[PDB]
Amino acid sequence: NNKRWYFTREQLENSPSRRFGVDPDKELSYRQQAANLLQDMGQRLNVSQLTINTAIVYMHRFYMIQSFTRFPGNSVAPAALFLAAKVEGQPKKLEHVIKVAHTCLHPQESLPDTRSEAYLQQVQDLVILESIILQTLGFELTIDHPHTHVVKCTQLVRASKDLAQTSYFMATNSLHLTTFSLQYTPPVVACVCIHLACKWSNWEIPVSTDGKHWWEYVDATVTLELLDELTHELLQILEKTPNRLKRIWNWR
Amino acid sequence: DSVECPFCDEVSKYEKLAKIGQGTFGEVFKARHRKTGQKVALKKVLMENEKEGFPITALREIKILQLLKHENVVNLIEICRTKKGSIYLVFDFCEHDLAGLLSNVLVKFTLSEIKRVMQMLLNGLYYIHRNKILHRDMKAANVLITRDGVLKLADFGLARAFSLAKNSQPNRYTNRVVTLWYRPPELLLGERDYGPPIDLWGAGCIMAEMWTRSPIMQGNTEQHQLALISQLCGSITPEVWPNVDNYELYEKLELVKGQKRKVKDRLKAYVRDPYALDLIDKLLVLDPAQRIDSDDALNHDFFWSDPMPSDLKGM
Ligand SMILES: OC[C@H]1O[C@@H](n2cnc3cc(Cl)c(Cl)cc32)[C@H](O)[C@@H]1O
Numbered sequence: 167n168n169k170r171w172y173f174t175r176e177q178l179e180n181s182p183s184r185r186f187g188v189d190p191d192k193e194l195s196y197r198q199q200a201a202n203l204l205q206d207m208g209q210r211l212n213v214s215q216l217t218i219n220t221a222i223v224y225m226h227r228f229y230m231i232q233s234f235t236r237f238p239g240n241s242v243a244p245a246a247l248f249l250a251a252k253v254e255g256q257p258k259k260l261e262h263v264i265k266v267a268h269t270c271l272h273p274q275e276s277l278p279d280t281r282s283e284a285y286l287q288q289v290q291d292l293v294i295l296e297s298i299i300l301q302t303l304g305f306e307l308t309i310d311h312p313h314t315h316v317v318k319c320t321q322l323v324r325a326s327k328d329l330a331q332t333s334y335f336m337a338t339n340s341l342h343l344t345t346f347s348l349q350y351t352p353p354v355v356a357c358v359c360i361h362l363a364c365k366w367s368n369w370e371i372p373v374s375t376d377g378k379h380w381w382e383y384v385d386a387t388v389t390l391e392l393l394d395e396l397t398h399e400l401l402q403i404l405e406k407t408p409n410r411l412k413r414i415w416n417w418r
Numbered sequence: 419d420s421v422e423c424p425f426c427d428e429v430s431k432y433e434k435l436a437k438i439g440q441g442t443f444g445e446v447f448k449a450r451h452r453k454t455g456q457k458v459a460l461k462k463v464l465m466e467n468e469k470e471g472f473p474i475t476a477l478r479e480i481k482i483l484q485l486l487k488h489e490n491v492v493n494l495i496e497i498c499r500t501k502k503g504s505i506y507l508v509f510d511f512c513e514h515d516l517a518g519l520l521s522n523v524l525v526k527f528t529l530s531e532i533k534r535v536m537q538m539l540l541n542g543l544y545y546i547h548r549n550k551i552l553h554r555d556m557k558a559a560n561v562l563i564t565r566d567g568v569l570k571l572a573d574f575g576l577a578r579a580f581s582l583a584k585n586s587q588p589n590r591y592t593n594r595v596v597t598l599w600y601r602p603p604e605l606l607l608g609e610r611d612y613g614p615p616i617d618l619w620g621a622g623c624i625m626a627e628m629w630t631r632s633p634i635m636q637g638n639t640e641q642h643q644l645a646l647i648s649q650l651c652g653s654i655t656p657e658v659w660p661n662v663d664n665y666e667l668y669e670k671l672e673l674v675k676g677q678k679r680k681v682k683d684r685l686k687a688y689v690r691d692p693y694a695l696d697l698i699d700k701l702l703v704l705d706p707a708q709r710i711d712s713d714d715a716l717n718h719d720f721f722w723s724d725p726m727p728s729d730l731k732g733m
Binding site: 170182231232236248249252253257259260292293296297298300301302303304305306307308 | 421422423424425426469470471472474477480481484485497499503505
């Protein structure tokens with residue numbers, strides 16, 4: 167059912183990777199790396215952030231079933247992006263995704279000869295891994311795109327242009343930097359991102375004309391207590407990520 | 419060694435029985451679950467050449483089947499693998515299709531049964547169109563029926579999603595869709611901004627095929643077809659079909675000039691009920707945006723007259 171790709175704290179603790187020697191902390195960065203590689207390749211291949219996000223989720227879900235010790239993120243990400251792009255209506259050719267993967271991962275080395283057996287096998291390899299990704303995901307590739315949720319919550323609080331841009335930024339970074347999307351529904355994540363965005367922007371969302379808090383209009387299950395914990399975790403990771411907070415930092 | 423695979427079962431859990439995917443396309447097997455005897459259909463994913471990985475059009479089909487969950491739409495149960503490697507789409511099996519029944523002369527439909535068939539068919543079109551999907555391959559062959567008399571639209575291998583076309587940019591959808599005989603005029607004239615109406619036309623050709631037991635407009639090519647259509651619906655003109663001129667292929671395809679609408683008439687001999695005739699007529703309309711839709715088609719007096727739609731047991 168619709169609880170299959172959602173996990174508990176304890177489940178996240180006992181990941182496939184954990185059972186193979188990988189610390190929580192190491193694994194979390196493995197995802198962050200793969201997510202970077204995705205973002206980098208996606209930008210160079212000129213696909214949408216939506217497509218890249220889809221890939222990142224394929225990546226996250228994938229590693230709740232497989233371990234980084236068997237499948238290195240550098241091999242899985244290109245395959246995941248190659249898949250995401252077809253799924254989302256922006257197919258990139260297999261050669262092209264391989265060229266771009268290569269430059270990203272070896273900015274020095276030169277692309278082999280398409281004629282080579284070396285190259286021909288890395289083509290077979292990507293196609294194989296796309297296959298393993300498909301199987302691992304149980305062929306369930308329709309993702310609930312999280313941006314649109316955020317947009318509707320900023321509209322729902324007549325947010326400034328700036329307050330929405332900041333929200334969108336939290337939103338995107340949470341996907342790269344946390345496993346929130348494996349733990350909480352897209353509606354909730356967006357509340358998290360809008361809450362943190364308000365705090366950062368020192369913006370106060372007025373209580374309802376009733377007394378109801380803004381988030382109750384989005385996901386009944388959302389309690390302030392929760393937002394505070396999630397926005398805390400997100401912010402800690404942000405503070406650890408060089409130059410990132412600089413992008414939304416008021417300088418005037 | 420081996421990779422964990424919790425959510426994709428090996429197709430060997432089903433026991434193949436017999437090729438049923440005729441037209442020689444798809445490679446479809448009837449099969450039986452080795453534990454419960456439950457029957458299913460296995461549609462193997464072609465893969466002929468496919469030099470771009472898992473076929474994009476298969477991903478499309480699998481997306482659409484997963485989104486469409488409804489009593490009148492075929493039902494994808496799961497997708498299965500092999501261990502080159504193969505991928506099978508697994509459906510709930512359905513004993514009959516409407517082509518098989520319409521050709522077999524041992525089979526006969528009371529007016530009311532027909533009514534039910536149309537009702538189910540139109541209901542399913544309502545559902546898919548509501549979900550922003552075009553079937554794009556309506557033909558009796560793709561209309562199944564179960565033992566218990568439930569009709570289901572199937573084979574979404576050509577299906578695609580469609581969008582509300584505003585922002586001053588008409589869509590560019592594939593034109594050469596839908597079998598020739600059940601293809602509508604819009605597509606022959608090379609339309610690329612088409613919608614739900616192209617399926618409704620199919621549904622027409624099928625309404626009549628319920629009495630004539632035979633696809634009512636058989637054509638050799640797109641040109642023989644388009645004439646044969648006009649030799650039933652009238653001549654294509656801005657008068658009958660506003661702005662039909664703008665299609666490059668209109669006058670640029672030697673369309674027969676002199677033809678008046680002979681649809682009710684050429685069909686009276688087969689279908690007696692004047693209500694059925696009227697519906698068939700409002701479905702075989704030339705101008706898409708003048709052709710009847712699934713909603714209105716269902717509220718048509720046809721479905722609310724004696725005899726009332728009856729369940730199906732005559733099969
Ligand atoms: O590949 C398209 C052709 O194969 C058969 N077919 C396709 N999907 C199917 C699903 C089921 Cl449950 C059945 Cl019984 C037949 C199917 C249909 O008979 C159709 O004509």
